[PDB]
Design a protein around this nucleic acid. Structure first.
Length: 1316
RNA sequence: AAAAGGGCGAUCUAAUGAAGUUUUAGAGCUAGAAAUAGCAAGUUAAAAUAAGGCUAGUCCGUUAUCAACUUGAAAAAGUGGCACCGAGUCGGUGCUU
DNA sequence: TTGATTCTTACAGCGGTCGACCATTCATTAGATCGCCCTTT
DNA sequence: AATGGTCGACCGCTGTAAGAATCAA
């Protein structure tokens, strides 16, 4: 028995745990070791860290589900088309679909003829010669009227249905609107027709290039408006161009309107909104919008269809045929130019599949960018290729028909081509003329997002309510699926429930009841003190609501005191400084319906609540129209349209029963009525909730009947990695309490922690910002990926190559002389993100180190900052922090706040994990039903321990080992315990419990909190070493800190060579193998793609994921003699379920015999094996091992490396040699690799002339060979050394397998040598 | 003090588009016994896209969870003595069952 | 002497380490939750 | 990106069977 505390450091991949006593010492105990070896007890130091792989998210699984459902629904649409064409195709070919389905099978396995389309070689070659691509057949079936073969018609319709197109456009993209210049001219003409006085016209503009550019839509709008001098952005023509581009302009100032008239062509309500505009402006303007609409139809198709739609009714097919013909002609010309000028490279461009070129781009499957980059120098070093470079610069040299650009193809063009083919070929076939709507619906149908999967109770993701338990088809969807109820289930499935009434839903934030509740709760507290004479009469509040809250939207206090406190009651008040509780939806519905008596009717309030809930639920217009038809008879048709135009979003916090349905028995009144009137004492909502006399609190506690630990962890808001770390943390705490014999700690001080993907995201952001900024910086200075990791160059390309503190330009390759400056002082806020860093020539450009850059900088750079913000190059937070100088800058309050943020946590995830720890530890209540808090759950911040290390020479290098996690946990425990002992008045900011305005006081208090740990003070007179050696607590005889003994204990603890580093063994869960489908080969490693497909004939997968390995000792045959061998086999995820419940069967199926079913051992990943000489290996897979030994470098060398990497140490030179010797000894002891060690030694002896700083910085990197885990690569002065992978597991078969507990204190060893 | 409005971030769900890959179809010509050499043409299409599963749906199948043993049916639970000297991954020495 | 036997001993087959090479992507739409940093009212 | 599957080349091990004795009868 003792009084101990626990220290925890929570991370996304690690959980450090440590145990301290009242003397800040770490106890050591002997633990029993089970198994077969003679070791029955091992001593350990009760401090360590649990390592674990990061927890991944469900985003990948969701993507897989969506892809699988998309594929299956496409296959089902094809099957619907086949079911339609079956009976008619039987009269033409009985084996047509049979040959189409068997196209994948080889002729050896093909039951019918090879050619699927027809069944003969002659007509097959004839069709492929006459129609080379399928777009030829598309255009032939669209344009020509001759009766074609039913097989070709089915092929065209199937290619249209299989790849329909994006449903991002609502309505009908009219193909007749194809040219941008003609439609822009028509828009200018109809604009001039409207106003003859000031006709805005410009013939020198070219809309086809300005409006159809690759820039941002707003940038194209700006470029077009800049070309016309008479027009402006706020003008009506600017809004017309915005509508043509789809920027959702507003026509308030253009038509002298008093309301907002926002029109968006992509939205569904547009027409209605348009009509509303046509109800306020003259109808003669309507044609203008029509023209604008036409422009919006031609500005998109300009990229989709490149041919005149009047030439043929298949514009996309014609564009594809033009692609094919241009490809053919350019390929012929290129072959001629190669055979005429440089034939020596012909075999390299038209015959090699490995290298790039026409043979690698077609047959080798190379990229189009690689193709262009490979041909660019060849076209530059030629004569008759000066014109082909014009097409290669626009990425249109040798274009295929199925490229990525085809993503921009909407389903409307394919629907039009299908309708054309159907109308042409229906005059010959009866079923085609009779079943046109069927195929049109097959290609048009799209399951709504608010319906989900079409399941009958076998899908945990589905929510659709069926009107009839029948098979759902694209034709009877609206009759089998209740779309309204499905959408309501979709929305209510994801909304929150009332925190006080868990079995009740929450009304929307725009509910009239919620607004009444807020107004009444806000109005209950009012001074209203006249001369001489807070009563808050219920009738008076009702009169105020009827006269002010129901007449004006925002009730301001100056108008309040003059309307009721002066006019109603004659007088000549300080409750609330506006009220922040307006009846906004009340006035909205009033302006919509123009009937105050209907709103003030108590009987009609239920209908109003249902209307508001319906407006909040659905977003689609058809849903709200179907759900508002029940109230159609109540209002006028115009009022009905205006109410269907209104749309609300957002949800409140309280249920409907908590606002008005609840009523105390003894009080005999509802809670809303209590807020309206409560006698002389007008109580509040919180007063009504937490009152010992109110029956409310008891019923609220009774309604909360209920769960598990994992369920509570999953409900927490945060990344899954943090939640996994938290779960491992509570497991570690449970096991630690178990080690202490079910004794609870006195304190638990817990502290949490705050790439090609990042490079790609940075490249995307820079490209988008420069495109919307219209700068040529990406063209002048070519930027490549993975180079933006450098902060200087990243900030250069983010600031368009110019300073943000002055108007000068920045020079490439001079960035080392330029400096990065923090927008807020690093002394105040310790933020090193891009939202706080600015690349400038000199720091003196900033106004002062005290505060934000002065307003003299803002008044000059605000325009540039706004241009950067509008280009999405800087966050709005950075704009605010830069321009804060105009708003007074930083005062003394926000400085104290920034200083306190660095010490106090104020993080909700930390609060929740502290609540979890407190609810798990403190579970006893006393006589007065008060919680007995035995364990203080202290929440500490990383900055505190980091400053402690930096101030007291307790440096730690992360690259050395994993001990730093345990050490940080120990330091957190020590610092938290000492802080609570020194300053108990601060327990409200650390210990989890119920617990200019002296701004400089708080600023200075939170600045030197830890100065009582120091051993000296620096007064203006000098360095006075008169610091109390025994720091104690005021009015408490307890000693808090001892400078003579406690530091020694901390140094000894950090110098301990035994730390419990444990790697969590986990079964690999995920995909079956690599997703790539490799071609066929003569190897058993190819996994079959289908049960009826052969890998050597069709290819398949290559690298399966090994999980749940099995050590087995059995006899195998090899004159077919049986030899008894022991080996571990790697089960794959695909065959994991089959291996379960069938050990002997699955093992004999692979070739094993006489398998000892009782000796089969299950081994996950990272399983620990001690071999010899203290070497430990972790089973990485079936045939790979990982370093499992931790190097314990002495703290002297750690501090030396830290001080020499920074340079201020000037430490001993031979320390480098001593560290090299220790690394070499550790390597020779546990690292089986010796060639890498010899290479390291040679490189070190070669680079001895380098300074001590660089030598230490590279010795830090050298520790990779001695780190725990998978071997990796490392560089020592540009001398990279490859990893040495342990490609065998034969030694592990006789090793000592160690099953370690969560903390590693309870071990079980098994000698595997006694199994063969 | 509070609301509101933005702006970034962590997640979760549903509906879609385009590519990618694989097998097959798209007859390759000439010379030559052959090995192979010389030419021509190449852009497209079908089918699959986790093996598959029963619960038979136009459903589900890559998230979370996992040291050992003993139970339970799963979840989950239970199972391992304490001080003192030291410290290279923990070793001893005392007590106590 | 002669087949069999008994080593026996040098030559082809086996199943271990170095050294690369590779690893399914882009893009929309519609919602719902929590969490933090700001300004504005 | 990471770290494990996979193929190619190499390569020491190894066990194996074809001489080389080696008895015995």
């Amino acid at each position: 028995d003792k009084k101990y505390s626990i220290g925890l450091a929570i991370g996304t991949n690690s959980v450090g745990w440590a145990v301290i006593t009242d003397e800040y010492k770490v106890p050591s105990k002997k633990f029993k070791v089970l198994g077969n070896t003679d070791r029955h007890s091992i001593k350990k130091n009760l401090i360590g860290a649990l390592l674990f792989d990061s927890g991944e998210t469900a985003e990948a699984t969701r993507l897989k589900r969506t892809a699988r459902r998309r594929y299956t629904r496409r296959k089902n649409r094809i099957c619907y088309l086949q079911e339609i064409f079956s009976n008619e195709m039987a009269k033409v070919d009985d084996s047509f679909f049979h040959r189409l389905e068997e196209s994948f099978l080889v002729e050896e396995d093909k039951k019918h003829e090879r050619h699927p389309i027809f069944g003969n070689i002659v007509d097959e070659v004839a069709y492929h010669e006459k129609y080379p691509t399928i777009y030829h057949l598309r255009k032939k079936l669209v344009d020509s009227t001759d009766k074609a073969d039913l097989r070709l018609i089915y092929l065209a319709l199937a290619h249209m249905i299989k790849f329909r197109g994006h449903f991002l456009i609502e309505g009908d993209l009219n193909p007749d609107n194809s040219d941008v210049d003609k439609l822009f001219i028509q828009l200018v003409q109809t604009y001039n027709q409207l106003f003859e006085e000031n006709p805005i016209n410009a013939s020198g503009v070219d809309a086809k290039a300005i409006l159809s550019a690759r820039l941002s839509k707003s940038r194209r709008l700006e470029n077009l408006i800049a070309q016309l001098p008479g027009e402006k952005k706020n003008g009506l023509f600017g809004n017309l161009i915005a509508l043509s581009l789809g920027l959702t302009p507003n026509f308030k100032s253009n038509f002298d309107l008093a309301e907002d008239a926002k029109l968006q062509l992509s939205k569904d309500t547009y027409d209605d909104d348009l009509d509303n505009l046509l109800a306020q402006i003259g109808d003669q303007y309507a044609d203008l919008f029509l023209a604008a609409k036409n422009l919006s139809d031609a500005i998109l198709l300009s990229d989709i269809l490149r041919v005149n739609t009047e030439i043929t009714k298949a514009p996309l097919s014609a564009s594809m045929i033009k692609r094919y013909d241009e490809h053919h002609q350019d390929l012929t010309l290129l072959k001629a130019l190669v055979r005429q000028q440089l034939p020596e490279k012909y075999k390299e461009i038209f015959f090699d599949q490995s290298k790039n070129g026409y043979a690698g781009y077609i047959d080798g499957g190379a990229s189009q960018e690689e193709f262009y980059k490979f041909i660019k120098p060849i076209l530059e070093k030629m004569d008759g290729t000066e014109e082909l470079l014009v097409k290669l610069n626009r990425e249109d040299l040798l274009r295929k028909q199925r490229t990525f650009d085809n993503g921009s193809i909407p389903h409307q063009i394919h629907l039009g081509e299908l309708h054309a083919i159907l109308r042409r070929q229906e005059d010959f076939y009866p079923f085609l003329k009779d079943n046109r709507e069927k195929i049109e619906k097959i290609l048009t149908f799209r399951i709504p997002y608010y319906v989900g999967p079409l399941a009958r109770g076998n899908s945990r993701f589905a929510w659709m309510t069926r009107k009839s338990e029948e098979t759902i088809t694209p034709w009877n969807f609206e009759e089998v699926v209740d779309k309204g109820a499905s959408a309501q289930s979709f929305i209510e499935r994801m909304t929150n429930f009332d925190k006080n009434l868990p079995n009740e839903k929450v009304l929307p934030k725009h509910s009239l009841l919620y607004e009444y509740f807020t107004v009444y709760n806000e109005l209950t507290k009012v001074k209203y003190v006249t001369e001489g004479m807070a009563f808050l009469s219920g009738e008076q509040k009702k009169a105020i609501v009827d006269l002010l809250f129901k007449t004006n939207r925002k009730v301001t206090v100056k108008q309040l005191k003059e309307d009721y406190f002066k006019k109603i009651e004659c007088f000549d008040i300080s409750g609330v400084e506006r009220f922040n509780a307006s009846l906004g939806t009340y006035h909205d519905l009033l302006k919509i319906i123009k009937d105050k008596d209907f709103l003030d009717n108590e009987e009609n309030e239920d209908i109003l609540e249902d209307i508001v809930l319906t407006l909040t639920l659905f977003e689609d217009r058809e849903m709200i129209e179907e759900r508002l038809k029940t109230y159609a008879h109540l209002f006028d048709d115009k009022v009905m349209k205006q109410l269907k135009r209104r749309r609300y979003t957002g949800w409140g916090r309280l249920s409907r029963k908590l606002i008005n349905g609840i009523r105390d028995k003894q009080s005999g009144k509802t809670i809303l009525d209590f807020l309206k009137s409560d006698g002389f004492a007008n109580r509040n909502f919180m007063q009504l909730i937490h009152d010992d006399s109110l029956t409310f609190k008891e019923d609220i506690q009774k309604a909360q009947v209920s769960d598990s630990l994992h369920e509570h962890i999953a409900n927490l808001a945060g990344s899954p990695a943090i939640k996994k770390g938290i779960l491992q943390t509570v497991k570690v705490v449970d096991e630690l309490v178990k080690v202490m014999g079910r004794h609870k700690p006195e304190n638990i001080v817990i502290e949490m922690a705050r790439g090609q993907k990042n490079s790609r995201e940075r490249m995307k952001r820079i490209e988008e910002g420069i495109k919307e900024l219209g700068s040529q910086i990406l063209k002048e200075h070519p930027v490549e990926n993975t180079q933006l990791q450098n902060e200087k160059l990243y900030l250069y390309y983010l600031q368009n190559g110019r300073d943000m503190y002055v108007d000068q330009e920045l020079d490439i390759n001079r960035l080392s002389d330029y400096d990065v400056d923090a927008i807020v002082p690093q002394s105040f806020l310790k933020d090193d993100s891009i939202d706080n860093k600015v690349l400038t020539r000199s720091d003196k450009n900033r106004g002062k180190s005290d505060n934000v850059p002065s307003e003299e900088v803002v008044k000059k750079m605000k325009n540039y900052w706004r241009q950067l913000l509008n280009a999405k190059l800087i966050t709005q937070r950075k704009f605010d922090n830069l321009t804060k100088a105009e708003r007074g800058g930083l005062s003394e309050l926000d400085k104290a706040g920034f200083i306190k943020r660095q010490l106090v946590e104020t993080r909700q995830i930390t609060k929740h994990v502290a609540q979890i720890l407190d609810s798990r530890m403190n579970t006893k209540y006393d006589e007065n039903d008060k919680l007995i808090r035995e364990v203080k759950v202290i929440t500490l911040k990383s900055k505190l321990v980091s400053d402690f290390r930096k101030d007291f020479q307790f440096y730690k290098v992360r690259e050395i080992n994993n001990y730093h996690h345990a050490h940080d946990a120990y330091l957190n425990a020590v610092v938290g315990t000492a802080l609570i002992k020194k300053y108990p008045k601060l327990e409200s900011e650390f210990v989890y419990g119920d617990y200019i305005g002296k701004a400089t006081a708080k600023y200075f208090f939170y600045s030197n909190i830890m100065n009582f740990f120091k051993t000296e003070i620096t007064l203006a007179n000098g360095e006075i070493r008169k610091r109390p050696l025994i720091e104690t607590n005021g009015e408490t005889g307890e000693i808090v800190w001892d400078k003579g003994r406690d530091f020694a204990t901390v140094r000894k603890v950090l110098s301990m060579p035994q730390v419990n580093i444990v790697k969590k063994t986990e079964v690999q869960t995920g995909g079956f193998s690599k997703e790539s489908i490799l071609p066929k080969r003569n190897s058993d490693k190819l996994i079959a793609r289908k049960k009826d497909w052969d890998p050597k004939k069709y290819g398949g997968f290559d690298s399966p994921t090994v999980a749940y390995s099995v050590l087995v000792v059995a006899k195998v045959e090899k004159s077919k003699k049986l030899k008894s061998v022991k080996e571990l086999l790697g089960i794959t995820i695909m065959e994991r379920s089959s291996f379960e419940k069938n050990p002997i069967d699955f093992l004999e199926a692979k070739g094993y015999k006489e398998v000892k079913k009782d000796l089969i051992i299950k081994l996950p990943k990272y399983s620990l094996f001690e071999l010899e000489n203290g070497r430990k290996r972790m089973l990485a897979s079936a045939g790979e091992l990982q370093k499992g030994n931790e190097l314990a470098l002495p703290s002297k060398y750690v501090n030396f490396l830290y001080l020499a990497s920074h340079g201020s140490g000037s430490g001993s030179g031979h320390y480098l040699d001593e560290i090299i010797e220790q690394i070499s000894e550790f390597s020779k002891r546990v690292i089986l690799a010796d060639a890498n060690l010899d290479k390291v030694l040679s490189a070190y002896n070669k680079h001895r002339d380098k300074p001590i700083r660089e030598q230490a910085e590279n010795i830090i990197h050298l520790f990779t060979l001695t780190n725990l885990g998978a071997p990796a690569a490392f560089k020592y002065f540009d001398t990279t050394i490859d990893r040495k992978r342990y490609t065998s597991t034969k030694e592990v078969l006789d090793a000592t397998l160690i099953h370690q507990s969560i903390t590693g204190l309870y071990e079980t060893r098994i000698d595997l040598s006694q199994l063969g």
